[PDB]
Amino acid sequence: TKVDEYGAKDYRLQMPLKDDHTSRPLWVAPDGHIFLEAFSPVYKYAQDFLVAIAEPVCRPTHVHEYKLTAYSLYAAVSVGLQTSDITEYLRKLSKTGVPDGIMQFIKLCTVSYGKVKLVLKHNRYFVESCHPDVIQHLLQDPVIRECRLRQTVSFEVKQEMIEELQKRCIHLEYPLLAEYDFRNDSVNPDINIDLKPTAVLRPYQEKSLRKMFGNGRARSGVIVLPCGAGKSLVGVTAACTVRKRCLVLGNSAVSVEQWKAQFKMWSTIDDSQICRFTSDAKDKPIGCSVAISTYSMLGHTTKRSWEAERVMEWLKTQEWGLMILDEVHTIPAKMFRRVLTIVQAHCKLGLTATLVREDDKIVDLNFLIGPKLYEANWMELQNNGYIAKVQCAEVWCPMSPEFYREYVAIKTKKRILLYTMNPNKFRACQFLIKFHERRNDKIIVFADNVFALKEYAIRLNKPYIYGPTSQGERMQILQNFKHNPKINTIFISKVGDTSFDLPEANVLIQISSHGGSRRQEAQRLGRVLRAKKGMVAEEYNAFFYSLVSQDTQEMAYSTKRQRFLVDQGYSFKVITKLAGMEEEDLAFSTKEEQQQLLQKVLAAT
Amino acid sequence: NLQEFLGGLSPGVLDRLYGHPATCLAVFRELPSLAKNWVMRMLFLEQPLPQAAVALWVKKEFSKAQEESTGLLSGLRIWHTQLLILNPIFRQNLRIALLGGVPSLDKYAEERWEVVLHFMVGSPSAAVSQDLAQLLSQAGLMKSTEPGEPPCITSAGFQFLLLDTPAQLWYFMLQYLQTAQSRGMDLVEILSFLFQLSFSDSLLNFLQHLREFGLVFQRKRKSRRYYPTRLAINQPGFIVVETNYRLYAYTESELQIALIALFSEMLYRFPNMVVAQVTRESVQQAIASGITAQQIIHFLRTRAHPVMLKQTPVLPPTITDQIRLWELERDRLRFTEGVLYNQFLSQVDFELLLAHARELGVLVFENSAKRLMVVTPAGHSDVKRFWKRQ
């Protein structure tokens, strides 16, 4: 904890230097931060071990950094590692050695796995363990006794209090191993789900499942892969391995349809088995081996309609061997977390790309679903060609003097509309769409403010999607955008920042955002991150632009929301000005047009 | 540069400098490519030659080289038109030159120079010498204002720190030579020695100063014989720059860490690595302290780890671009003192005053549409007098 003169954590009195440090690429500070080198000959071996024990904090192209947390270690033991194996290899990798504090810390968070297990059977939840002593210790805890239902020893626990039990179990240093023994579970009938030979999983996809199925039993946890990496295939493959009834929880009506199509494309399951449970319609969820729905539908708290209530009654009174939870990072929400207890599932698999949230509830996924089983490196996949290369940028659009006059003075939350509706910003978006369309690029434009989305959509005469648009109508636009050459640019709102699969969307633009939501930014860039047909690894196939207003609060949010992407190596080149704009017939070229726009923005309030 | 320095000298000192042959050879060597031949031609000649002949000895192609070399030598006053014979002393002295009449050292030079840099920054462990302290303070790169208290670093002092060791040393000698005359030390004696080194009381003091900077080393309790170091005649990088504003400095020296800490925040310290983050707060502080962005990019550029060398640009463009934007952000408002004139009732005469202001070179900005202009207060009286004259 010694601090140098330059506010630096002096760690020279703490650890020594290894003589053969040149070959060893790892640093290990007593704070737990681990700085691995990406140019070392032994990087590949170190990364896989390190990513498991420590969740990456930043992974630039040269020197990566990781942090050691109790949850990060608890994932290491679940996959198959052991304290002796981790510390010995860590010492072998360390070019400075492991400080005594970290060495004991690693040991502390490894003698907690396997002590207690959670088993669901016959619609009943039981706390299983082979050591009566640890169970007795738990019983001493008040809340643990409170949630109790009102050799190996097991006591039944009420479903409604599973969350509180799990949260306290971690707090008692006794994580519950919610591990599903699907291969030794004949009670639940085996479904006809099978992986067609045409579907081959990429090395990272298979590696993620290997951690999930390291032993015969199936592990429940959160699997993180970059947007467009193919999490749909991994989720489908997990169901194929389980061969039991599978529940898939998307994020919206668009998510389930793509989940439905991916199952058909990447699995032999017949169309009759696949079903949807959404407000738009339902494919007889009462009879179906694979159910696809949305958190909103299942997590709905108010009284459900008769059509939905009947399905909900069936869902609660069922046993699911695998509950795939797409967009896991939304789970720790107050109500969406309830969907875990409402539905009965043995193994909960979580798929997501941006395991980040502006609150501190992202850690709750450790016990709500399980430890982070895997986390692929974005740059590693980007160079391999599995995900398109993106040249992120931040177009600096100077604020209009008439607008800035009002923005500086106004502070009653009306600023957002003012600098979202920047005529200078509009022209950059207008020019960018025109230039990129001439290059046969499929443009996507995002805007958190629907007002801004509508203003830009009609003015450019381009399709726009947001809340009120019916599921069929928005689905139609995507199909037109996917295939119709005429529809080269689409406008989307907060609805389509996640789960939208547009493989051919080379270009992306963003004219607005909801504060510094790193999750929103990384998710939004995901739409165009899908692998392209004629993609070349080092040709910058895709592009991302985040229009911002200079000398405005949007600058602070623009830097805030770039934190996650830069942590993965993405560099956000700054574009002060765009060439060729002057010679272009763009809108708002006269003060009268800009003057008219400002009045309308003020009127909206 | 060295040739630059000689040009800025009087003819009297130059001829005195052209003393023992080694000096003439030293000044000869810096003749770029052409004038070296011309010197050999009119070396055995005792009779001046026409200026036209020199002009026509160079083909029309690459003619600009003919003039530039001639101007350089005219500045050096090697020859005179004499109406182009060389200096009789230079011709004679040069003719004397032209057939007439280790690993420990580099480490010593690097270390002794480093301790001076250590003293430059607020390093408690640095060589202390009253003569050296006043030398730097009078060199224009440091200021004390209180002899009892250790001196601080001036705005130019911080920039000097980032400069590469060759340019860092040369600038110091250049300042040293200029102040040698003011303190009473003859410039020719020291300047002649530097040339002779490339191959009296004044020298004894000068040699001691050179010993202090680590350029020369007697090794024998200050004997007559000295052993100049590599730097006296006139290295792999260790910094890894990331796209997320992170510097990993593979440094064992406290000086380099002190340098990098100037424009970045130090996070962790490891024996062969230090983690620094280039936060805008630090860079803005570095720019405010006096540093120039180009130096920061250059300082990181020169001390670039080998791994980054293969990449092009070695420094990721966003980092270099971002540093510049942090620099340019501070100077958004360009303050400029001036005097404004308005109520220009005489619209016709306003242009005449505008023309008069332009002729004097005082006008900074003007607005014909609003009939107004701004003039610096230095020239305010001149324009005010012109208006009063009517």
Partner: peptide
């Protein structure tokens, strides 16, 4: 063959 625009290709900073 559909090269990148000027702004993305080379720095746009005045410095």
């Amino acid at each position: 063959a559909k090269e990148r625009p000027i702004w993305l290709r080379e720095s746009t900073v005045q410095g």
